[PDB]
Design an enzyme around this catalytic site. Structure first.
Site, PDB file in Angstrom:
ATOM      1  N   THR A  66     -16.845 -52.256 -12.896  1.00 48.60           N
ATOM      2  CA  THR A  66     -15.477 -52.512 -13.393  1.00 48.60           C
ATOM      3  C   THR A  66     -14.792 -51.696 -14.455  1.00 48.60           C
ATOM      4  OG1 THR A  66     -16.081 -54.798 -13.324  1.00 48.60           O
ATOM      5  CG2 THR A  66     -14.269 -54.475 -14.637  1.00 48.60           C
TER       6      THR A  66
HETATM    7  C1  LIG Z   1     -17.741 -53.373 -12.419  1.00 45.98           C
HETATM    8  C2  LIG Z   1     -17.623 -53.480 -10.920  1.00 45.98           C
HETATM    9  C3  LIG Z   1     -19.195 -53.047 -12.810  1.00 45.98           C
HETATM   10  O1  LIG Z   1     -19.973 -52.474 -11.776  1.00 45.98           O
HETATM   11  C4  LIG Z   1     -17.399 -54.774 -13.036  1.00 45.98           C
HETATM   12  O2  LIG Z   1     -18.015 -54.992 -14.251  1.00 45.98           O
HETATM   13  C5  LIG Z   1     -17.702 -56.036 -12.182  1.00 45.98           C
HETATM   14  C6  LIG Z   1     -17.187 -57.231 -12.975  1.00 45.98           C
HETATM   15  C7  LIG Z   1     -16.803 -58.350 -12.258  1.00 45.98           C
HETATM   16  C8  LIG Z   1     -16.398 -59.460 -12.959  1.00 45.98           C
HETATM   17  C9  LIG Z   1     -15.996 -60.611 -12.312  1.00 45.98           C
HETATM   18  C10 LIG Z   1     -15.990 -60.665 -10.938  1.00 45.98           C
HETATM   19  C11 LIG Z   1     -16.391 -59.558 -10.225  1.00 45.98           C
HETATM   20  C12 LIG Z   1     -16.795 -58.409 -10.884  1.00 45.98           C
HETATM   21  N1  LIG Z   1     -19.124 -56.311 -12.036  1.00 45.98           N
HETATM   22  C13 LIG Z   1     -19.718 -56.517 -10.876  1.00 45.98           C
HETATM   23  O3  LIG Z   1     -19.159 -56.478  -9.808  1.00 45.98           O
HETATM   24  C14 LIG Z   1     -21.182 -56.809 -10.931  1.00 45.98           C
HETATM   25  C15 LIG Z   1     -21.946 -55.539 -11.237  1.00 45.98           C
HETATM   26  C16 LIG Z   1     -23.409 -55.900 -11.369  1.00 45.98           C
HETATM   27  C17 LIG Z   1     -24.260 -55.937 -10.376  1.00 45.98           C
HETATM   28  N2  LIG Z   1     -25.410 -56.304 -10.892  1.00 45.98           N
HETATM   29  C18 LIG Z   1     -25.247 -56.487 -12.185  1.00 45.98           C
HETATM   30  C19 LIG Z   1     -26.099 -56.849 -13.116  1.00 45.98           C
HETATM   31  C20 LIG Z   1     -25.732 -56.979 -14.428  1.00 45.98           C
HETATM   32  C21 LIG Z   1     -24.430 -56.712 -14.725  1.00 45.98           C
HETATM   33  C22 LIG Z   1     -23.576 -56.341 -13.712  1.00 45.98           C
HETATM   34  C23 LIG Z   1     -24.004 -56.238 -12.481  1.00 45.98           C
HETATM   35  N3  LIG Z   1     -21.618 -57.263  -9.629  1.00 45.98           N
HETATM   36  C24 LIG Z   1     -21.972 -58.516  -9.401  1.00 45.98           C
HETATM   37  O4  LIG Z   1     -21.952 -59.393 -10.236  1.00 45.98           O
HETATM   38  C25 LIG Z   1     -22.413 -58.819  -8.007  1.00 45.98           C
HETATM   39  C26 LIG Z   1     -23.883 -59.116  -8.050  1.00 45.98           C
HETATM   40  N4  LIG Z   1     -21.754 -60.029  -7.593  1.00 45.98           N
HETATM   41  C27 LIG Z   1     -21.070 -60.097  -6.466  1.00 45.98           C
HETATM   42  O5  LIG Z   1     -20.935 -59.164  -5.701  1.00 45.98           O
HETATM   43  C28 LIG Z   1     -20.453 -61.445  -6.188  1.00 45.98           C
HETATM   44  N5  LIG Z   1     -19.602 -61.433  -5.003  1.00 45.98           N
HETATM   45  C29 LIG Z   1     -20.396 -61.042  -3.839  1.00 45.98           C
HETATM   46  C30 LIG Z   1     -19.601 -61.244  -2.580  1.00 45.98           C
HETATM   47  O6  LIG Z   1     -19.201 -62.604  -2.555  1.00 45.98           O
HETATM   48  C31 LIG Z   1     -18.325 -62.972  -3.609  1.00 45.98           C
HETATM   49  C32 LIG Z   1     -19.076 -62.800  -4.891  1.00 45.98           C
END
Ligand SMILES: *[C@@](C)(CO)[C@](*)(O)[C@H](Cc1ccccc1)NC(=O)[C@H](Cc1c[nH]c2ccccc12)NC(=O)[C@@H](C)NC(=O)CN1CCOCC1
Ligand SMILES: [Mg+2]
Lengths: 244, 250, 231, 240, 233, 235, 211, 222
Positions: free
Chosen positions: G1
């Protein structure tokens, strides 16, 4: 169940008094009189041992006057056993404060802590209160020489001169009469003994029926000394003041 | 279940009296006479072995008890209460002192600990006070010989000589006439036997009297040799024969 | 008298007065009827209102798809006990993939109520329950008393004036037990039974409460215009 | 633990222990609170049965809960220390979690909640204390004066008194205090507070304590001589 | 968390037209040591269920006791314990599956793989698997450990899908199970010749066969095999 | 003495029955439910003229769609309100929706019988819980310390309750407007109150689907009082 | 993000991207990284999506309860602190949450940065996430207090675009918010694919890219 | 060391229509390179016109579904048989998942149904509780194979109208249930070809105002 046998020690009377506190005060009124007098250059603590015996070992005995730390002492009126429980707690609180802040505990702070413990037994727990009234004599660098008293209700007040135990009504009148603000320790010593001599229920006031202590800046330069009087020293001060 | 008696059973009455403590003192008054006398070079404590039945072996019942090597105790009042107090007193001498400072407590501090236990039974929830008065005799390096009385309230007083129980009033008067500050231990034992004879009705001999002393160190009773600083216990219980020997010179 | 201060005290004749006083609360409560055939089991309850502006207190509670009860007495105590039944019915399903037997449900209620009658501090439950259900051994009706006593019956009634409905069912025993594969006629017999306990008041649309469970019938409650058919 | 229900209902619908706690408040020394246009004054009685007292070190009747809020009371002295301590802790706890000092209304609501909790908790008795809580909210120049009591009810007052002979001084305040025009200055507010205590106190010497609280954490306690001047002026006008 | 010590190998099973068959060898291995040769790993629960267990034997004995206690507890205040309210295979399985999943969730698993085989009240066949992870699945054929790799392929040639179950007789199914056990004896290093077999039929009830042996084994062709490549003698 | 959870020979809990006597001593609170909204009104009853009456808070917001009036030992209500507010917002957290008025009331009533030897005694306060939801529309509940709650078209609690309830018996009908209900609460409050009713010693409030729960200003209530006086003098 | 937020003359701007990742795989093209706590409070999200959603929705519970008890809207300073106190209870337990608390209160517009460590910083401008360095470059060179609402909205929009382009784990779409004293205002969902080409032509930027 | 997690393979797919919704999933259950079952249902009717599927670690997936079904039951008991809306179910599941934030349910969860306006709805979750409403979502083993296909054939991504040359997009016309099921079947047929954990069978659950309907289709068994 057990409710049947509960005295309910922590309740109000219809008049708004705490039964057990009032009855504990009645107990204390039969205890040996203890007097505290505060002067400009020190504090005096005098107290009367209760109907002693010739076979009592006086020089190793302690029922009235106790040391809380180097700066603070207490005179006791009431159940000695109850008082020792509280005294050991107060000694610990003083050391906790010293360990935390690296300064000797202010007199009032120690007094408030003990008084708060007494208060707790009147409001919760269902236990009887401590049948003890203290006179605190102490010194600190904020307020200097201080006299306090606490009773089973947990209420405490500061004094220039005060008595607890037996005949406090008579004793307080005599102190109120002869006390003056510019008074000194040697004069206060005389007042304390004269007051006990007149209020005592005994035929005559002797050395073996007394405990005595002073807190003086009469220590070499800016510092404070506690003096718990020995039997022979009480005998000498009785002759000096002209009672025996 | 659960102990639902979390409230005090000892309370102040309108007159300021603590009834249960007074009643405990009454139980002590009914108890068999025991006494203690302090000499210049020792202390003696004594009492009558009031045997409940002649079939009972009164040697197995010990009214005079060792608390530490240099401290002993005797009582008047309820025997079972005394027995458990001795158990607790022996233990507290270790837990709250010996395991900390590596030495046995002085008489006055052990007395203080016993007193605390008896005070707590006077204030804690769901318990009655102990129905005993204790006489604790002992010696320590910096205070010398000493004799203390401990009451059901938890109050304790040091004595030159005293008595508790059945005929205490008469016995204390007898001791006032005989006691002085120049008494040797043997003289104190002699006075103890004289004082105790007045309160005893029946047989008066080594088998019906229990007597112990706090005196000189007993290296023969230590159980080992090799350490000069360890010289043995000052507490010693007099034998049946040792008592009878002193009853001929009575 | 001197032996009714708490539940932990027997009287000199071996009675437990606090339990008997809890039993009294049921008699003050509004009437409710229970009856069953071999295929279905029915609850009929007369609901009570505070006044004309107030609603009519609900009497019937669902415990599972195959089990439920009607109450008479302290309603909050029924909520506590019905909540317990819901949990036990649910524990049986989640752990054993097994619908809870009505007989075993009664045994659990008995044991829960009993603990309150032998311990100091607590109190007995102040409510009576009629449990109906359909399990692997067919239709069932239970009567629960807060003394702990649970009884399996063909029919019964509890509450104020319940003796009239109970006598009717005792006469009709041979008839209504045979009403198999006909839910409406079994309810009719229940409505006619509870009618023997009425005085002054009669069964209106927001007064009457009916519940049924059976072979191919989940436990369902009927209130409002859904019971106008049976008035 | 000791679980005994001490505060319970009686057949007539009264909780006697809470009502007997009010009798302890009736016994306590008189306390009075008057709010002016730009200030609040807290007056307190000191019973003169106790002389030979050390007034330097004796617990003062008015206590600071924070730099902008004060608390006075009537009833059991030992009980009041427990409420004050709890209040002081909550005041710092509020600053620590919300980054603003407590409002006077919030602090009152907390203290009243503590008093209430002790009326339906097992093993405890009600506080034999009624409090007057006064001060100014952060960045606000409107005066605040609240009262609490053992039952746990609280409310805001233009002026109020509690303790012994509070019936008399409330009578005085009801006829002397005008809502349309409250004491405009500090002088007028203190004068009215001293006047009200002089209906009950006895001697106007060391028996009257006055504490003025102004906006923006401006709290001061008047001395004996300053109060004595009010006492002198009041009686000289009265001789007419 | 632990490690398995004394272990039991494959348990194999399949459905047929009127019931289910289950089998398991009588060995308790201690690593590569074939320590215990008289261990029963098929445990009947009533007359309508058989639980087959592989993995840690100490945990097996624990489970065996839970089931024995389950039968005792079901009979309590139950007049229909030997009839309508008797224990069903689905009840017994869900109990075990609840236990297995709880234990893995405390990170202290029962180191086993379990197959519950039986026939329900309505005559329906029951066959479901559960393991130390709490993972559950059902199929016409089920097997644990090595059986999953070697037996299932053979048993699925008989019952490849659900529609093949009514076409499969008990003689054909038993024959297939017995052949599979032989294949496992050829190829599983922690297996034994001796085994137990149980049939739960909706008509003929529970038939429990003990002290069975693998027979009709082919070894004669070994005489011709010489060396590892170039050796002739 | 005797247990706190003791049954009387008639089958009632002594303490619950005694708490009901405390509620009879409390100040009057009235609720009226209509198809245009629910109106809640209370008697403030200041003990002295120096008491600033606007600090008397006997009508309280639980959620945007639920309000509450109280009568009896009003100090006891604070923890009930706190629980109600928490329950209302917690359900919104778990389910992303408003909570049903009945479900909220049930949650409050679950506290009622949690007393014994938990709290040491029942609550000494009754609550009129008024609100709106999509399923059952505008609702008014009466929550007692017995744990029981009844739904009402109109209800009065407090010292002038039985006199007010008899009046509500005659006056209420299913076609009442909100304005008519407002005047009706004021009318009945004025009838049972000791002191003369005005905008300072009495308070009105309502809950509508559009605007939610609102406590009325003293200026707004004053006009409704003046409107009442004129319509009573009209015949 | 990539998230950003900044105070200015006419309130505070808040802009976020919409991408979500699961390693190299783009799991979501259109995720809401803002939470409308109340009509005057916003919450950005960066880090673990689960942590960001749970704790900020729990913050909204706690901010609503504040309004009911005190009869007054919570401040931005107090709201940010409640959130930071939550983080300190699960201190070291492995939460991943970086957020800005944007809003308008009695002191005017407010902006606080809060992260999983319990950090709480007040400031005029913040940017969080994997692509925050790219956003800061555009912001620092173009930010003024004297910005118009139209120009400010564009700046935050353009700053996210800068990051979405270069940062592999940022993109999808841009969500704009403008916080005033009458409350916040949503200014739409803007696809980066379409926005990039639009900005390239109109602004003349991204000359290096062929279009 | 004991590993409390496992991978049971499988793949699931949810698509939201204008007035309907589908939730599909393959019926294959696996460990490593072995097949456990060729027909082990993965998509469940949870009541109140809601369908659910937890893909990943079967034991955790079964536990979650079991808990949600239970949550629906208690929602009826506690709130007067009120219907649990799809948005309320989604929020409830978030809290079930975050219960185990520090020992997660290793599953990708999808639910489908109708919103309160009658329109089709799909909600997607991650293992720790982040959720969001979507039009289209594939989860599980072959999620990366299928999702791009759905971006192209459901949301018409990278598709423009001929003749304009990139200036005008393909308009977002809605899809019928018959058109959606074709995309679902083609998605799983394609996934079965290139992913070893996908195959055996395909079970689709369709949700309309009329109720929940099932459809089953065979897949390659290699
Ligand atoms: C950037 C994309 C960082 O890569 C953003 O911070 C983003 C923040 C964010 C906040 C609220 C909603 C969605 C996104 N972060 C992520 O997308 C995050 C990145 C990530 C992956 N593993 C991590 C571990 C520790 C910190 C950040 C991490 N991704 C996720 O949280 C993934 C695991 N979650 C999803 O993809 C959830 N969705 C999947 C499809 O279905 C709906 C929910
Ligand atoms: Mg494949």
């Amino acid at each position: 169940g057990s409710r049947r046998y509960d005295s309910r020690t922590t309740i109000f009377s219809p008049e708004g008094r705490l039964y057990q506190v009032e009855y504990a005060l009645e107990s204390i009124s039969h205890a040996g009189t203890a007097i505290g007098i505060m002067a400009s250059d020190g504090i005096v603590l005098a107290a009367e041992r209760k109907v002693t015996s010739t076979l009592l070992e006086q020089d190793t005995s302690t029922e009235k006057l106790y040391k809380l730390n180097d700066k603070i002492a207490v005179a006791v009126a009431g159940l000695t056993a109850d008082a020792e429980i509280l005294i050991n707690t107060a000694r610990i609180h003083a050391q906790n404060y010293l360990k935390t802040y690296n300064e000797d505990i202010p007199v009032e702070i120690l007094v408030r802590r003990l008084s708060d413990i007494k208060q707790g037994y009147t409001q919760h727990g269902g236990l009887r209160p401590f049948g003890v009234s203290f006179i605190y004599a102490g010194y600190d660098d904020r307020y200097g020489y201080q006299l306090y008293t606490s009773n089973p209700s947990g209420n405490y007040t500061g004094w220039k001169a005060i008595s607890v135990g037996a005949n406090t009504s008579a004793a307080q009148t005599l102190l109120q009469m002869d006390y003056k603000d510019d008074m000194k320790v040697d004069d206060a010593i005389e007042l304390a003994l004269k007051t006990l001599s007149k209020t005592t229920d005994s035929s005559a006031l002797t050395y073996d029926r007394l405990e005595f202590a002073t807190i003086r800046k009469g220590a070499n330069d800016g510092e404070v000394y506690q003096k718990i009087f020995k039997p022979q020293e009480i005998k000498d001060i009785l002759v000096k003041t002209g009672i025996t | 279940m659960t102990d639902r008696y979390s409230f005090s059973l000892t309370t102040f009455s309108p007159s300021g009296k603590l009834g249960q403590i007074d009643y405990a003192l009454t139980a002590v008054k009914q108890g068999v006479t025991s006494l203690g006398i302090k000499a210049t070079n020792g202390v003696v404590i004594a009492t009558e072995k009031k045997s409940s039945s002649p079939l009972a072996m009164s040697e197995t019942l010990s009214k005079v008890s060792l608390l530490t090597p240099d401290i002993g105790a005797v009582y008047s009042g309820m025997g079972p209460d005394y027995r458990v107090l001795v158990d607790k007193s022996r233990k507290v001498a270790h837990t709250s002192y010996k395991r900390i400072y590596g030495e046995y407590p002085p008489t006055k501090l052990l007395v203080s600990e016993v007193a605390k236990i008896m005070q707590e039974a006077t204030q804690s929830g769901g318990v009655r006070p102990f129905g005993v008065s204790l006489l604790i005799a002992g010696h320590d390096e910096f205070n010398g010989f000493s004799l203390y009385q401990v009451d059901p309230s938890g109050s304790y007083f040091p004595w030159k000589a005293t008595a508790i129980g059945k005929g205490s009033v008469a016995a204390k008067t007898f001791l006032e006439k005989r006691w002085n500050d120049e008494l040797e231990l043997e003289d104190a034992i002699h006075i103890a036997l004289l004082t105790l004879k007045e309160s005893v009705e029946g047989e008066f001999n080594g088998d019906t009297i229990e007597l112990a002393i706090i005196g000189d160190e007993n290296p023969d009773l230590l159980g080992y040799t090799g350490i000069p600083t360890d010289k043995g216990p000052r507490f010693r219980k007099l034998t049946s024969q040792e008592i009878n020997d002193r009853l001929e010179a009575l | 008298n001197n032996y009714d201060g708490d539940t932990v005290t027997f009287s000199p004749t071996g009675r437990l007065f606090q339990v008997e006083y809890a039993l009294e609360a049921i008699k003050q409560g509004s009437v409710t009827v229970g009856l069953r055939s071999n295929t279905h089991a029915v609850l009929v309850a007369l609901k009570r209102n505070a006044d004309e502006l107030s609603s009519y207190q609900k009497k019937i509670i669902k415990c599972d798809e195959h089990m439920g009860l009607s109450l008479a007495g302290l309603a909050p105590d029924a909520r506590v006990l019905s909540n317990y039944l819901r949990q036990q019915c649910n524990y049986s399903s989640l752990v054993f993939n097994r619908k809870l037997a009505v007989e075993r449900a009664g045994h659990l209620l008995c044991d829960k109520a009993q603990k309150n009658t032998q311990s100091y501090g607590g109190r007995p439950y102040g409510v009576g329950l009629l449990i109906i259900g359909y399990d692997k051994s067919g239709a069932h009706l239970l009567e629960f008393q807060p003394s702990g006593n649970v009884t399996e019956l063909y029919g019964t009634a509890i509450g104020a004036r319940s003796q009239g409905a109970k006598t009717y069912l005792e006469r009709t025993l041979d008839t209504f037990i045979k009403i198999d594969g006909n839910p409406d006629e079994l309810i009719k017999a229940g409505v006619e039974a509870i009618s023997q306990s009425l005085r002054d008041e009669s069964l209106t649309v927001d007064n009457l409460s009916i519940a049924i469970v059976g072979k191919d019938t989940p436990f369902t409650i009927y209130d409002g215009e859904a019971v106008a058919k049976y008035i | 633990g000791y679980d005994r229900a001490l505060s319970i209902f009686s057949p007539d619908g009264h909780i006697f222990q809470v009502e007997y706690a009010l009798e302890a408040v009736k016994r306590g020394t008189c306390a009075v609170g008057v709010k002016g246009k730009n200030c609040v004054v807290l007056g307190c009685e000191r019973r003169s049965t106790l002389k030979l007292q050390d007034t330097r070190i004796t617990p003062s009747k008015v206590s600071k809960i924070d730099s902008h809020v004060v608390l006075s009371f009537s009833g059991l002295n030992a009980d009041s220390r427990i409420l004050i301590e709890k209040a002081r802790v909550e005041a710092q706890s509020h600053r620590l979690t919300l980054e603003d000092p407590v409002t006077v209304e919030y602090l009152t609501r907390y203290v009243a909640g503590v008093q209430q909790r002790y009326t339906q908790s097992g093993g405890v008795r009600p506080f034999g204390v009624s409090t007057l809580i006064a001060g100014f909210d952060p960045r606000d120049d409107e005066p605040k004066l609240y009262q609490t009591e053992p039952s746990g009810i609280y409310s805001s007052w233009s002026a109020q008194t509690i303790g012994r002979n509070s019936k008399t001084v409330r009578e005085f305040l009801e006829k002397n205090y005008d809502r349309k025009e409250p004491p405009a200055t500090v002088e007028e507010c203190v004068k009215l507070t001293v006047r009200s205590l002089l209906e009950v106190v006895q001697t106007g010497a060391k028996n009257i304590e006055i504490t003025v609280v102004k906006p923006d954490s401006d709290i001061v306690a008047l001395s004996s001589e300053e109060i004595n001047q009010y006492v002198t002026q009041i009686e000289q006008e009265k001789q007419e | 968390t632990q490690q398995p010590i004394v272990t039991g190998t494959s348990v194999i099973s399949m459905k047929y037209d009127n019931g289910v068959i289950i089998a398991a060898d009588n060995l308790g291995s201690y690593g590569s040591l074939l320590r215990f040769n008289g261990v029963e790993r098929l445990i009947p629960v009533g007359d309508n269920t058989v639980v087959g267990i592989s993995g840690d034997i100490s945990d097996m004995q624990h489970i065996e006791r839970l089931l024995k206690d389950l039968v005792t507890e079901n009979a309590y205040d139950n007049p229909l314990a030997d009839a309508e309210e008797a224990l069903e295979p689905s009840y017994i399985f869900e109990y075990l599956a609840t236990v297995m999943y709880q234990r893995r969730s405390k990170m202290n698993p029962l180191w086993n793989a379990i197959i519950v085989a039986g026939v329900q009240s309505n005559g329906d066949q029951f066959l479901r698997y559960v393991n130390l992870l709490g993972v559950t699945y059902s199929s016409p054929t089920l097997a644990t450990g090595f059986g999953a790799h070697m037996a299932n392929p053979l048993l699925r040639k008989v019952v490849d899908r659900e529609s093949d179950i009514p076409k499969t007789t008990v003689q054909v199914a038993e024959e297939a199970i017995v052949n599979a056990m032989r294949v496992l004896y050829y190829r599983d290093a922690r297996s034994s010749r001796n085994f137990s077999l149980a049939i739960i039929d909706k008509n003929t009830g529970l038939t429990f066969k003990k002290n069975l042996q693998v027979e009709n084994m082919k070894w004669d062709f070994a005489k011709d095999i010489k060396g590892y490549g170039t050796q002739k003698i | 003495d005797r247990g706190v959870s003791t049954f009387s020979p008639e089958g009632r809990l002594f303490q619950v029955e005694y708490s009901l006597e405390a509620i009879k001593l409390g100040s009057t609170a009235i609720g009226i439910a209509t198809k245009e909204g629910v109106v809640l009104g209370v008697e403030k009853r200041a003990t002295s003229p120096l008491l600033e009456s606007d600090s008397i808070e006997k009508i309280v917001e639980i959620d945007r769609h639920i309000g509450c009036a109280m009568s009896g030992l009003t100090a006891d209500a604070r923890s009930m309100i706190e629980h109600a507010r928490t329950a209302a917002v917690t359900h919104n957290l778990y389910y992303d929706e408003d909570i049903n008025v009945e479900s909220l009331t049930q949650s409050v009533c679950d506290l009622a019988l949690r007393f014994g030897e938990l709290m040491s005694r029942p609550f000494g306060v009754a609550l009129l819980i008024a609100g709106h939801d999509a399923d059952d529309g505008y609702q008014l509940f009466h929550a007692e310390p017995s744990g029981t709650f009844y739904r009402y078209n109109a209800k009065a609690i407090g010292s002038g309750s039985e006199g007010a309830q008899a009046e509500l018996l005659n006056e209420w009908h299913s076609s009442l407007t909100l304005k008519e209900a407002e005047l009706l609460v004021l009318k009945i409050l004025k009838q049972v109150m000791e002191e003369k009713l005005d905008e300072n010693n009495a308070q009105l409030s309502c809950i509508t689907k559009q605007d939610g729960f609102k406590i009325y200003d003293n200026e707004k209530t004053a006009e409704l009082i003046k409107e009442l006086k004129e319509k009573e003098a009209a015949e | 993000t990539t998230t950003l937020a900044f105070k200015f003359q006419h309130g505070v701007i808040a802009a976020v991207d919409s991408r979500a990742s699961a390693g190299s795989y783009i799991s979501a093209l259109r995720m809401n990284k803002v939470i409308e706590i109340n009509p005057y409070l916003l919450g950005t999200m960066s880090g673990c999506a689960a942590d960001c959603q749970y704790w900020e929705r729990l913050l909204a519970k706690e901010c609503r309860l504040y309004y009911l008890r005190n009869g007054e809207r919570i401040s931005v300073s107090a709201a940010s602190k409640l959130l930071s106190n939550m983080m300190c209870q699960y201190r070291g337990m492995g939460l991943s949450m970086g957020s800005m608390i944007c809003g308008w209160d009695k002191k005017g517009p407010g902006l606080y940065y809060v992260d999983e460590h319990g950090t709480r910083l007040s400031g005029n401008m913040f940017s969080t996430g994997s692509g925050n360095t790219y956003a800061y470059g555009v912001l620092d060179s173009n930010y003024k207090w004297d910005l118009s609402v139209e120009d400010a909205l564009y700046l935050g929009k353009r700053s996210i675009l800068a990051a979405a382009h270069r940062d592999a784990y940022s993109g999808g779409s841009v969500n704009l918010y403008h916080v005033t004293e009458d409350g916040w205002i949503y200014h739409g969902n803007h696809d980066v694919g379409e926005l990039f080409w639009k900005v390239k032509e109109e602004e003349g930027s991204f000359n290096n890219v062929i279009g | 060391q004991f590993n409390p997690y496992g991978d049971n393979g499988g793949t699931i797919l949810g698509i939201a229509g204008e007035d309907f919704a589908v939730l599909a999933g393959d019926t294959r259950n696996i460990t490593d390179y072995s097949i456990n079952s060729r027909y082990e249902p993965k998509v469940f009717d949870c009541g109140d016109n809601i369908v659910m599927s937890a893909n990943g670690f079967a034991a955790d997936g079964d536990a979650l579904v079991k808990r949600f079904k239970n949550s629906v039951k208690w929602y009826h008991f506690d709130h007067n048989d009120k219907k649990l809306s799809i948005n309320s179910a989604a929020r409830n599941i978030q809290h079930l998942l975050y219960s185990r934030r520090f020992f997660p349910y290793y599953v990708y969860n999808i639910i489908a149904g109708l919103d309160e306006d009658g329109k089709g709805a799909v909600y997607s979750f991650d293992p720790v509780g982040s959720y969001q409403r979507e039009q289209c979502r594939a989860g599980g083993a072959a999620a990366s194979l299928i999702m791009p296909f759905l971006d192209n054939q459901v949301n018409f991504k990278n598709q423009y109208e001929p003749g304009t040359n990139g200036k005008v997009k393909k308009p977002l016309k809605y899809l019928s249930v018959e058109e959606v099921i074709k995309l679902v079947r083609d998605s799983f047929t394609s996934a079965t070809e290139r992913h070893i954990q996908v195959g055996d069978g395909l079970e689709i659950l369709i949700v309309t105002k009329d109720g929940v309907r099932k459809e089953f289709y065979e897949l390659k068994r290699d």
